[PDB]
Symmetry: D2
Subunit: 234 residues, 4 copies
C-alpha cells in the first residue's frame, strides 16, 4: 500500500468510518480516519484557499482552509514525518465523489519544499493556470486540465454537473526530497485554491493535498470516502 | 516598555533570573525569562546557524541552532503572536556581554514574513555580507558592520578580542507588518549565522533574534543577561 | 539634483519636451526625456500590469505593460546602472496629473533586488494590499494609502474622481543596495498593477517606477509632464 | 535531432569548428558553434560560478562566469527563445572530455522559470548537495552523484584523475514550461558552481547549462568538443 500523509478537506461525513458529523478539514497519517479534524464550513460554490505547513523543527503539520468572507478552519497535528514518509515522495492533489458529488476544481496549487543544513536543497512550483497538456503533472484517474486553466480532479459533466463515483489526482512530476538525515530543517508548505460546487443535495467527497511514495497510484476502489488516497477505511 | 518577542542563544546561565543551569536556547515572550528553553552546547569559535520559524496557523514559534558537526538544539513554544506583538514591528538581532564576554558576530542574516489572505504582502531580506555602511540596518548601541563583511553586535577588538559591558543590535530598516487581524496566515522565518568566540572564564551573554515595536530601542541597562532586549528581569 | 532611473507609463504626449505623439512607455535615465519609448495603448479604467527587469549581466533595463486582453507594450534599453545610480537607492512609484488628469492607482507592487557575490544580498517585497497606515512606505506629496486597499499616487476624490496638478510617490522604507562594485550580478525587477481612469479630454500624466538616491524627494514643480521625478525637462 | 539552447563554458578551443583560440563562454543556439562568445580565463582547480539569465521582455540570453578572486567573463545574445525552443523542455547540465580532460564537478545548481501574467506558473529548484540517489535528476552517460555531495558530470578516476572520452549530463526530472503564448513575461535563470581541474596539462572540454526537448538524450559521439549537446559540429 502507498504511504499517505494528507490534509483532507472532507465535505461528506462518513460517521461509519470515524468522520465527525460535520464537514471538516483533517490531518491523515496512513489512515483516512484523520488524526485531527476541525469543523469546516464548506462554502458551496465559493473559491476556498487551503494552506498546509510543516517543518521538521516544530514538527507540526498545520492546515488552514479559508474563504474570502473570512471564515477559516484550522487543524494541526504534531507528527514526525521522518518516521512516516519515505525520504523521497511525490506530492499531489486528490479528490473523489461517491454516491454524492461535487466539482473538485483546483484553480491554483503551489508547493515549496526545503532541506536546509548549515547556511539548502529546495523545490518550488506554482500553478496558477493549468494547461491542457500540463507536462509537469502526473494526472491520475479522472483528473483533467485546461483550457479554462483549471484542474478538474473529478468528473464534471458537459452541462456542468459533477459526477458521482469519480476520483482523480494530480501529482507533481518530479520526485520531492521531503526529508534528509543531514538536514537541520526540512520544511514544506502547500497552498491550493479550489472551487467545490454541489448543485444536487450534498457535496461529497472532498479534496486532499497529499504526500506519498513516488510510485503512488489511486488505490482501486478509492472513490468516495477514501478520497483517492486509501485502499480501505482502516 | 518595548514589546519583545525573541529567540535567545543564551550563552550564560543566570540561574538567579530563571535561566536553566547551562547554555540554552530559549523562546522569550515579553520577558527575558524564557517560556521554553533547550540545553545548548555552544561551540566556541565555531560558526553556528539559527533558524527561527513562526507558523501563524500552527501558532508555534520554533528555533533550532546547529553547528556543522550536526549537534543541534531545538525549542518550540505554542503561542499566538497576534496576542503579543503589535501589528507593525522591527525585526533584528541583539547581543550583549556583561562581566563575562564573547564575540557576537553575525556572518549572515535572512528574514521572511508573509501576510496572506486569499489567492499576500511579504518581505524578505538576506544579508550574506555586511558593508561598513549597511544602510538598510539600524545599528543600535555597540553594533557595527564591515569591513570583514560581518555584523559585530557587541564591541570586539581590532584583533578579534571581545569586550565586556557591551550591547548592540541591528534592526532591519523597514517596518514589518508581522500580523494583521484579517491575515489567514501570518508567517515568518529568520535565519542567522553567528560566530561566538570567547577565551573567558565563561562566554556571555548571548545573541537574540527579536521582534519589537518599531520605535524599539535598547532599554537602559540591558547589557549582560538582559541581552539588549529587556529593561529588567521580570 | 536627485539621480533618477525610471520606467514611465506616460499617458500624455508632451511633444515639446521630446515625448512621441502618443501614450508610451519609456525608459528614463537621469532625464524625463526617455532614452527609449514604445507606443502604449493605455486602456482607460482597465487594470494594467507593468513588469520591470534589469540585469547587470545583460546590462539591459526592460519594461512590459500589459492589460488582460493581451495588448502589451515593450521597451528595453541597453544601460549599465553601475554607471548611473548610486550604490544605495530607494525604489518607488511616482505619478502626476497636470492641466489634465487621471487616477494613478496602484493595486499591487513588488520588487526584488539581488546582489551576488563573488554570496547574495537580496531584498524582496510584495504589496498586494495597501493599508491606511502603510508603515513600510514613504508617501510623498499626494500619495495616499487605502482602502480601497490601494495606493493612490495622486489625489482622487473618495468618489473616484482624479484631481489636476497632483503629484505623489511611494518609496519603500528601506534603502536598497542596488549595485556594488564587487557584485557579479546586480539585478532587480519590479512589477506593479495599476488603474488609470480619466473622463478628461486627455489623460495625464502617467505613473513611473523609479529608483532614486536614498534622500530623494519630489522636486519642486514636477507635477504634470515631469512625473514627480525630475526638476526640469532637460 | 534534439533542439539545444546552451550556455557553454568551453575550456578547449576547437578552432577547426569555429571556437576562438582561447577558452571562452559561449551562447549556443542549435549549434555547438556559439552565436556569441567571450574570452574566459578558466581558473584551474578553483570554484567558478556561472549565472544564466533570460527573459522574454528583453529577449537577451546572458551569462556570466566568475571566480571568487573577481575575474568574470560575460556573454549575451539577443535571441527569441519562443522560436527556438519547444514550449516544454528539460533543463540540464552537460559536460564532456575528449582527448584532453578535466573534472567537470558541479557543486550546486539552481534554476527558476516563471511565466507571468496575463498570473504565474513557476518552477524553482535549488541543489546545494547532490545525493547518491538523486531522484529528481535524470543522469545521463557518465554523470554521477557522490557523495561528497557533488555532481561529477564526467568520469573521474579513483586516483582523482579525470578521464578522456567522457560525457555526462544531469537533467531536472520535471519538464519545464519555458514559454507559453498567453504569458506576458517568460523568464528563466540558472546558476551553477563548478570545479574544473585538469591534472593532465590541458583542460577539455567544458561544461554547459542547456535547455532541450523533454526526451533529450546524449547524442552518440558527443564526447569531446560537442559537450554532450550536439550530434555534430555543424
Ligand atoms: C562573576 O559572575 C557574575 O556575578 C556577579 C556578582 O553577582 C554579577 O555582577 C554577574 O553579572 C554580570 O555578568 C553576567 C555575565 O556577563 C551578566 O549576565 C549580568 O547581567 C552582569 O552584567 C555574574 O553573574
Ligand atoms: C491644454 O493642454 C496643455 O497645454 C497648456 C498650454 O501651455 C500647458 O499648460 C500643458 O501642460 C500642463 O498639463 C500637462 C498634462 O497634464 C502636463 O504635461 C504639463 O506639465 C502641464 O502641467 C498642456 O500641454
Ligand atoms: C446516502 O448516504 C449514503 O448511504 C449509502 C448506502 O449505504 C452509501 O453507499 C453512501 O456512501 C457512498 O457515498 C458517500 C458520499 O459520496 C461516499 O463517502 C462513500 O464512499 C460511498 O460512495 C453514503 O454512506
Ligand atoms: C592534440 O589536439 C587534438 O588533435 C587531435 C587529432 O586527432 C584531436 O583528436 C583532438 O580532439 C579530441 O580532443 C579534443 C579535446 O578534448 C576534443 O575537443 C575533440 O572532440 C576530440 O576528442 C584535438 O583536436
Ligand atoms: Ca468523509
Ligand atoms: Ca543568560
Ligand atoms: Ca508626458
Ligand atoms: Ca571547444
Ligand atoms: Mn474525514
Ligand atoms: Mn536565558
Ligand atoms: Mn514620456
Ligand atoms: Mn566553444
Amino acid at each position: 500500500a502507498d504511504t499517505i500523509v494528507a490534509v483532507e478537506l472532507d465535505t461528506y461525513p462518513n460517521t461509519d468510518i470515524g468522520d465527525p458529523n460535520y464537514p471538516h478539514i483533517g490531518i491523515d497519517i496512513k489512515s483516512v480516519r484523520s488524526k485531527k479534524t476541525a469543523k469546516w464550513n464548506m462554502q458551496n460554490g465559493k473559491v476556498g484557499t487551503a494552506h498546509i505547513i510543516y517543518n521538521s523543527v516544530g514538527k507540526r503539520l498545520s492546515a488552514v482552509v479559508s474563504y474570502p468572507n473570512g471564515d477559516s478552519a484550522t487543524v494541526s497535528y504534531d507528527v514526525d514525518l521522518d518516521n512516516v514518509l519515505p525520504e523521497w515522495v511525490r506530492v499531489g492533489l486528490s479528490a473523489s465523489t461517491g454516491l454524492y458529488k461535487e466539482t473538485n476544481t483546483i484553480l491554483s496549487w503551489s508547493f515549496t519544499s526545503k532541506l536546509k543544513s548549515n547556511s539548502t536543497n529546495a523545490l518550488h512550483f506554482m500553478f496558477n493556470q493549468f494547461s491542457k497538456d500540463q507536462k509537469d503533472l502526473i494526472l491520475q484517474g479522472d483528473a483533467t486540465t485546461g483550457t479554462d486553466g483549471n484542474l478538474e480532479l473529478t468528473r464534471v459533466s458537459s452541462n456542468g454537473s459533477p459526477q458521482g463515483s469519480s476520483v482523480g489526482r494530480a501529482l507533481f512530476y518530479a520526485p520531492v526530497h521531503i526529508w534528509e538525515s543531514s538536514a537541520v530543517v526540512a520544511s514544506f508548505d502547500a497552498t491550493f485554491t479550489f472551487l467545490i460546487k454541489s448543485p444536487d443535495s450534498h457535496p461529497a467527497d472532498g479534496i486532499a493535498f497529499f504526500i506519498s511514495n513516488i510510485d503512488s497510484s489511486i488505490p482501486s476502489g478509492s472513490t468516495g470516502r477514501l478520497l483517492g488516497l486509501f485502499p480501505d477505511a482502516n
